[PDB]
Scaffold this active site. Sequence first.
Site, PDB file in Angstrom:
ATOM      1  N   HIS A  40       0.900  -1.287   0.189  1.00 23.75           N
ATOM      2  CA  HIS A  40      -0.044   0.035   0.006  1.00 23.75           C
ATOM      3  C   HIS A  40       0.857   1.285  -0.080  1.00 23.75           C
ATOM      4  O   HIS A  40       0.156   2.310  -0.006  1.00 23.75           O
ATOM      5  CB  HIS A  40      -1.031   0.005   1.220  1.00 23.75           C
ATOM      6  CG  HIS A  40      -0.401   0.261   2.322  1.00 23.75           C
ATOM      7  ND1 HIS A  40      -0.017  -0.354   3.428  1.00 23.75           N
ATOM      8  CD2 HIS A  40      -0.304   1.510   3.124  1.00 23.75           C
ATOM      9  CE1 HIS A  40       0.274   0.042   4.584  1.00 23.75           C
ATOM     10  NE2 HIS A  40       0.283   1.265   4.445  1.00 23.75           N
ATOM     11  N   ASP A  84       0.110  -7.500   1.831  1.00 27.26           N
ATOM     12  CA  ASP A  84       0.531  -6.237   1.810  1.00 27.26           C
ATOM     13  C   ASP A  84       1.933  -6.213   1.946  1.00 27.26           C
ATOM     14  O   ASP A  84       2.536  -6.010   3.005  1.00 27.26           O
ATOM     15  CB  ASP A  84      -0.053  -5.366   2.919  1.00 27.26           C
ATOM     16  CG  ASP A  84       0.078  -3.917   2.790  1.00 27.26           C
ATOM     17  OD1 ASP A  84       0.642  -3.536   1.773  1.00 27.26           O
ATOM     18  OD2 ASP A  84      -0.041  -3.358   3.792  1.00 27.26           O
ATOM     19  N   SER A 177       3.934   2.896   8.291  1.00 27.72           N
ATOM     20  CA  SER A 177       3.756   1.911   7.021  1.00 27.72           C
ATOM     21  C   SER A 177       5.044   1.351   6.287  1.00 27.72           C
ATOM     22  O   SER A 177       5.691   2.153   5.884  1.00 27.72           O
ATOM     23  CB  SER A 177       2.475   2.271   6.141  1.00 27.72           C
ATOM     24  OG  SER A 177       1.434   2.358   6.913  1.00 27.72           O
TER      25      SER A 177
HETATM   26  C1  LIG Z   1      -2.534   4.711   7.869  1.00 28.40           C
HETATM   27  S1  LIG Z   1      -2.141   3.036   7.949  1.00 28.40           S
HETATM   28  O1  LIG Z   1      -3.118   2.282   7.329  1.00 28.40           O
HETATM   29  O2  LIG Z   1      -0.906   2.954   7.067  1.00 28.40           O
HETATM   30  C2  LIG Z   1      -1.799   2.292   9.514  1.00 28.40           C
HETATM   31  C3  LIG Z   1      -0.705   1.948   9.639  1.00 28.40           C
HETATM   32  C4  LIG Z   1      -0.457   1.613  11.109  1.00 28.40           C
HETATM   33  C5  LIG Z   1      -1.389   1.477  11.949  1.00 28.40           C
HETATM   34  C6  LIG Z   1      -1.315   0.900  13.650  1.00 28.40           C
HETATM   35  N1  LIG Z   1      -2.550   0.780  14.187  1.00 28.40           N
HETATM   36  N2  LIG Z   1      -0.719  -0.126  13.741  1.00 28.40           N
HETATM   37  C7  LIG Z   1      -2.624   2.173  11.608  1.00 28.40           C
HETATM   38  C8  LIG Z   1      -2.767   2.557  10.355  1.00 28.40           C
END
Ligand SMILES: CS(=O)(=O)c1ccc(C(=N)N)cc1
Length: 223
Positions: A40, A84, A177
Site C-alpha cells: 500500500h 500487503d 507503514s
Molecule cells: C494509515 S495506515 O493504514 O498505513 C496504518 C498503519 C499502522 C496503524 C497502527 N494501528 N498499527 C494504523 C494505520
Amino acid sequence: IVGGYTCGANTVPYQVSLNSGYHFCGGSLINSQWVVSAAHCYKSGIQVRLGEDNINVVEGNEQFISASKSIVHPSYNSNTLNNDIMLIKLKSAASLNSRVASISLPTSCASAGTQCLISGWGNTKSSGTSYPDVLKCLKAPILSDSSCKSAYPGQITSNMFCAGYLEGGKDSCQGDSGGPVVCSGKLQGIVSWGSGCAQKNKPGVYTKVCNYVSWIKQTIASN
Ligand SMILES: CS(=O)(=O)c1ccc(C(=N)N)cc1
Ligand SMILES: [Ca+2]
C-alpha cells in the site's frame, strides 16, 4: 510510533525511508540492492534513503539511491490489505557498513509471545498529529491469533498477525507503514494497518513475512 522511545542514531541499520519529495513510508533493507516494504506504499518515482536518523538533516551517514523497479505482490488486495508486501530494487547496490546493514529473512515463523522491535518516523500521537524527525522505537509482543481475530472480526487472514498491547497506548501509526518488525534478529513483519493508533483493543496488524520467503527469494533471483 506512539508510546515508543528514541532509538538512537543508526541503531536500526536496516531501516530505510521511502522518499517522493518527502518521507511517506518505511522499509527494510534485505540485501545490498533490495528493499521490502508494504504494497500500500506503492508509487512511482521512489528514492530510497538509507542510514537516516533525522530525516530533515543530512548528518553524514546517509545514502540516497533511486529505485529501478518496484514489484507489488501478485495477490495484493487493496481493499482487505491481504498480501500487503512489495519489493523495491535499487538502481545501484548500497554500501554496507555498521550503520547501513541488511536484516535477515526468517527461516521459521515467530510465535505469539515473542518480543519484537518496531521502528519508524510515523505519527507519535493517538489523538492529533505530531511527526518526529528522528527514528522512534517500540518493543512489543506478538499477540495470539485468537486475540487478533477477536479484535478484528472477519478481517484477519493467515498472512497477518497482531502485535502490540490490547490496553492501547503503544502502537505503530500513519507514516510507519512499510516499516520493519524484527524479532530475534529476523524480519518477521511489515507495518500494515490497524484502526486508528494505540487505541484500546485495536492492536497493530502486520504482514506475516515468513509466508513470503519463497516469493521474495525467487523474485530477487530473477530480477
Ligand atoms: C494509515 S495506515 O493504514 O498505513 C496504518 C498503519 C499502522 C496503524 C497502527 N494501528 N498499527 C494504523 C494505520
Ligand atoms: Ca538525515
